[PDB]
Amino acid sequence: MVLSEGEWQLVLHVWAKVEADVAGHGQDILIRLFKSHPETLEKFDRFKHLKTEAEMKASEDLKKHGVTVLTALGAILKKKGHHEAELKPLAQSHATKHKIPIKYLEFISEAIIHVLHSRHPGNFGADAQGAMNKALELFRKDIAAKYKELGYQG
């Protein structure tokens, strides 16, 4: 559960490379999630009509969304676990407005790791992927606890 500082530094070193082009990494991650787990795309009323990866790549609104998502996760990871304030509104919206089960949070965690593994082998070898997995597990564990407080079974 609690990450060491060395683990957080591996997380934030690969995140630094994401931040060279957040919009590009958000397209790759959302696309990989929708292609790997098509049922997740059904949660997005604004995007669920998109039929192909081409359409998804060409969607200016999907790209803006990817930037929103990754910048919110970035701000969470930069808290190195002290993320209670940031998780409150995110848990509430994803529980009550969007109804995102923890299993779908696991799917997007898998999509993040796939994309960083593909793009960043210089900063995402086994130890670094292990540290990112632990950070994402922590995030899901803390969101699951907030979901239960908010009444949503997740």
Q: Which residues bind ligand O=N[O-] (CB under 6 A)?
A: 4, 6-7, 30, 32, 36, 67-69, 71, 83-84, 87, 92-93, 96-97, 110-111, 114, 125-127, 142, 146
76-100 as b/e: b if 16+ CB within 10 A: bbeebeebeebbeebbeebbeeeeb
> Residue 33 in contact with residue 106, Cβ under 8 Å?
no
Determine the interface stretch with ligand HEM among 17-25, 101-109, 113-121, 127-135 (rule: CB under 6 A): 101-109
Q: Determine, following the binding rule CB under 6 A, whether residue 94 of this chain makes contact with ligand HEM.
A: yes
Q: How many CB atoms are closer than 10 A to CB 30?
A: 25
Return the one option of ligand HEM, ligand O=N[O-], none that residue 55 interacts with (CB less than 5 to 8 A, by type). Answer: none
Determine if residue 65 is labeled as part of a ligand binding site.
yes
Nearer to ligand O=N[O-] among residue 16 and residue 93 (C-beta): 93
The angle subtended at Cα 131 by Cα 3 and Cα 110, nearest 5°, is: 125
Interface with ligand HEM in residues 1-30 (CB under 6 A): none
- Local structure of 33: helix, strand or coil: helix
Nearer to ligand O=N[O-] among residue 11 and residue 87 (C-beta): 87
Total residue count of the chain as it appears in this document: 154
Distance CA 16, CA 4 (A): 18
Task: Pull the structure tokens for residue 153.
Answer: 């079974």
Q: Determine, following the binding rule CB under 6 A, whether residue 108 of this chain makes contact with ligand HEM.
A: yes
Return the one option of ligand HEM, ligand O=N[O-], none that residue 40 interacts with (CB less than 5 to 8 A, by type). Answer: ligand HEM
